[PDB]
Design a protein around this ligand. Structure first.
Ligand code: HEM
Ligand code: HEM
Ligand SMILES: Cc1cc(N)nc2ccccc12
Ligand SMILES: Cc1cc(N)nc2ccccc12
Ligand SMILES: [Cl-]
Ligand SMILES: [Cl-]
Lengths: 362, 362
C-alpha cells in the first residue's frame, strides 16, 4: 500500500517533470522501469536530472516564499552517495562554502540519501546550518531565544557555548544506526558575518549587532515523486526584513527596538510617536546598508516583491497555476506598499515541495 | 419559506440576546409573540432593547475590526420611524453632529427602516457620509480616485464639484417609490477636517494635506435576527494608519509618498534606502499629531492592537468564541510589532453582523 502511494506519486511527478523538460516521449518507458523497480525493491531512485528539476519544482511550489522568481537557477548538489558522518560533515562544510561564494550568494541545495522505509539515513538537528545559540537561566537571557532548546540538547552532548550573544552552534546530526547525534564546531573561516552599521547614524555601531550572511535551512523535508529527502539543506540570500524586522526586533528574539530608538536619538515612551515603527525602519535600512557595504547578497522587500510580481507573470505565461500564502508573502515592513498586499493567493499545496518535520530534540 | 428562514434566525437571535441581557425567562413568550407576528405579517419588529443589543453584537462579531473592545458602548439611534427624504437627510445630518461631538468622537449607528420583503425603504448611495469626490479626464486625476464612480453618478444627477482635491460629496440616497435618488450638499459647519502637519518638520504643511475627522460607513447592511437593515450608517474614530498608510499613501488613492519623501528631505530613488517606509512612518506620525493637536479622537495601531488583545481576553472570560480575519486585523505599518501578527484567528461568520451589498451606481 505504501508501494501504491509511491507509484502514484511517481507517475504524477515523472509525467510533469518530463513534460517540462521536453522529454514526454520518454515517460512511458521510464514509468515502466520505475514500476518494476518499486515491485522488486520497494522504492525507486531518481535520475540526476529528475532530482535536480524536482528540487527546483519544490522551490517553485513553496507558497510562503517571495523569492521564487529564481527557482530555475537553484544549484543542486547530489550527495546521495554519502555513507559516513565525516562525509556528511564535509558535505555540509562544502555547502556553506559554495553557497556563500565570497558573499555573492548562490542558492544551493545539498541532497542526502532519502528515507528508505520511513527510516532516515541522516537526520540533521540544526534548524539552519549557521545559527546562534540561546541561553536562559537565573533570569538572564543570552543570544537567540529561538535556539534555546537546540542549544540545551547540544550542551547535553558535551558541547559548551562561550555565552556571547552570537555563539555559533555546532553542526549536529545523527546517522542511521547510531543512538546519538554527533556534533562538529563550525570553522569560523567558513562563516561570513556582517556587523550592522547605519549609513548616517554613527552611533549605531554602539549596539554591536551583527548577523550571519547566509540562511541555510536544514530541518525541512524535500518530497519529490513520493521520495522523502528528509535531509536536504537549502539556502538563498536574505530579504533584509527577515533580519531587521524579525530576528533582531521580535520581543521573543533579540528584542532590540528600544536600544535602536535610543541610539537614533528618539524617545521610546509614547505609542503615538510611532517610535517602534521609526526604529524598525532605521534598523532595516542599517541591515541593507551593512550587507551591501560588505559585498554580501541581500534583497530589500520592495525589490523582492517586484521580482515576485514577475514570478506571477511568468507562471501565467507558462500556463501554470500560481499558489501562495498571503500571510507569509507580505513583508513585515510596509506590506501595503507592495502589490502582494492588494491581491489574493490560492494556498493549495502542490508537490514537489518542502515540508516541516518533527524536531528530534524537544 | 422566507418566513421559515426569518423564524429560525429569530429564535437563534432572541435566545442569545436575552441570555446576554439576563432575560432568559422572557424568551419563550417573546418567541411566541414573534411566531404569531411572522404568520400574520410576514415579518417582525424588534424591541428597542433588541435592536440596540443586536447592533452591538454585530460590531462584536465584525471579524475585520480591530476596534471591537468598545462594542458594548455603541450609541444606537433608532430611526425606524422615518418616512420622508427630509427626515432621512436630517437624521444623517444629526448622526454627523452627534458622532462628531466637537471632536470627542462617539461611536454611533443610526438605524433606518429595514427591508420589508427584500424591498428597501431607504437606500443610501454614499460609501461614507463624509467622503471626498474624485475625477479623471484628459489624463488629469483630481481628488480621491476611489470616489470616481459615485462622483460621476452625482454629477449625472445635477451635482457639480468644484474639482479641488477635497470636494465633499453630497449626501445621496433614494426612497422607496422614487425612481431616482436625491442629493443634499453637506453643511460645512457639520464637517470637522484636520490639516496634516508634522511635529517637527515645518515644511510638511507645504503638501496641503487634510482629512475629515469621522469615518461614517453608510453602505453596509446590518442583519439582526433575520431582519435586514440595509440602511444603517455607523462610525468610530480612525486608526491613524487608515489615513496615513492607505488613504493618503496608496497609488490608487492620493498617492502622496514621493511628495512626502521630498518634504522630509530624503531621496526617493533607491528601493534599498527604504524611502517609502520612512515616508510612511513620518506621514503616519503627522496624521496622529495633527488629530491630537486639533482635539479630534484617533488611535494609533499599537494602542489599538493592545485594546484588541483585551477584547480577546474579554471574549475568553465571557466564554464566547472569538472570530477574526487576520488579513484585515494586522495594521499596514509594522504589523509584526503587534501581537495580532503572531497568532491566528477563526474567520467564521457569526450573526448579528454587518455585510456588503451591491452598489446601486456602477
Ligand atoms: C534566493 C533568495 C531567497 C529569498 C530572498 C527568499 C525569501 C524568503 C522569505 C522572506 C521567506 C519567509 C520567511 C519568514 O517570513 O519567516 C521564505 C520562505 C521560504 N522559502 Fe524562500 N527565499 C529565497 C530562496 C529560497 C530557496 C532557494 C528555497 C528552496 C530551495 C526556499 C524555500 C522557502 C520555503 C520552503 C519557505 C517557507 C519556510 C516555512 O514554511 O517555514 N527559498 N523565503
Ligand atoms: C471606535 C473606533 C473604531 C476603530 C478604531 C475601528 C477600526 C477599524 C479598522 C482599522 C478597520 C479596517 C479597515 C481597513 O483596513 O480597510 C475596521 C473594519 C471594520 N469595522 Fe471597525 N473600528 C471602529 C469602530 C467600528 C464600529 C463602531 C463598527 C460598527 C458598529 C465597526 C465595524 C467595522 C466593520 C464592519 C469593519 C469591516 C469593513 C469591511 O469589511 O469592509 N467598527 N475597523
Ligand atoms: C531558503 C530561505 C531563504 C530566505 N531568505 N529565507 C528563508 C526563510 C525560511 C525558509 C527558507 C528561507
Ligand atoms: C466604523 C469604522 C471605523 C474605522 N476607524 N474604520 C472603518 C473601516 C471600515 C468600516 C468601518 C470602519
Ligand atoms: Cl532567519
Ligand atoms: Cl477611510
Amino acid at each position: 500500500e505504501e508501494k501504491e502511494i509511491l507509484w502514484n506519486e511517481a507517475k504524477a511527478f515523472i509525467a510533469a517533470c518530463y513534460q517540462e523538460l521536453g522529454k514526454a516521449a520518454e515517460v512511458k518507458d521510464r514509468l515502466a522501469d520505475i514500476k518494476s523497480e518499486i515491485d522488486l525493491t520497494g522504492s525507486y531512485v531518481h535520475t540526476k536530472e529528475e532530482l535536480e528539476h524536482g528540487a527546483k519544482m519544490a522551490w517553485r511550489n513553496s507558497n510562503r516564499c517571495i523569492g521564487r522568481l529564481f527557482w530555475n537557477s537553484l544549484n543542486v548538489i547530489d550527495r546521495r552517495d554519502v555513507r559516513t558522518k565525516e562525509e556528511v560533515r564535509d558535505a555540509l562544510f562544502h555547502h556553506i562554502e559554495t553557497a556563500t561564494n565570497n558573499g555573492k550568494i548562490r542558492p544551493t541545495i545539498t541532497i542526502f540519501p532519502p528515507e528508505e522505509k520511513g527510516e532516515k539515513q541522516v537526520e540533521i538537528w540544526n534548524h539552519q546550518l549557521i545559527r546562534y545559540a540561546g541561553y536562559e537561566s537565573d533570569g538572564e537571557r543570552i543570544g537567540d531565544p529561538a535556539s534555546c532548546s537546540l542549544t540545551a540538547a547540544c550542551e547535553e552532548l558535551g558541547w559548551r557555548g562561550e555565552r556571547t550573544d552570537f555563539d555559533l552552534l555546532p553542526l549536529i546530526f545523527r546517522m542511521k544506526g547510531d543512538e546519538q547525534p554527533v556534533w562538529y564546531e563550525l570553522p569560523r573561516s567558513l562563516v561570513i558575518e556582517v556587523p550592522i552599521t547605519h549609513p548616517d547614524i554613527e552611533a549605531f555601531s554602539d549596539l554591536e549587532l551583527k548577523w550571519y550572511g547566509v540562511p541555510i535551512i536544514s530541518d525541512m523535508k524535500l518530497e519529490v515523486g513520493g521520495i522523502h529527502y528528509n535531509a536536504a539543506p537549502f539556502n538563498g540570500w536574505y530579504m533584509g526584513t527577515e533580519i531587521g524586522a524579525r530576528n533582531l526586533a521580535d520581543e521573543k528574539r533579540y528584542d532590540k527596538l528600544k536600544k535602536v530608538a535610543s541610539v537614533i536619538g528618539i524617545a521610546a515612551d509614547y505609542n503615538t510617536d510611532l517610535w517602534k515603527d521609526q526604529a524598525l525602519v532605521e534598523l532595516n535600512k542599517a541591515v541593507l546598508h551593512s550587507y551591501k557595504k560588505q559585498g554580501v547578497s541581500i534583497v530589500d522587500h520592495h525589490t523582492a516583491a517586484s521580482q515576485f510580481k514577475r514570478f506571477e507573470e511568468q507562471a501565467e505565461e507558462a500556463g501554470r497555476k500560481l499558489t501562495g500564502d498571503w500571510t507569509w508573502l507580505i513583508p513585515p515592513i510596509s506590506p501595503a506598499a507592495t502589490h502582494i498586499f492588494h491581491r489574493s493567493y490560492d494556498n493549495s499545496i502542490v508537490k514537489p515541495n518542502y515540508f516541516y518535520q518533527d524536531k528530534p530534540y524537544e
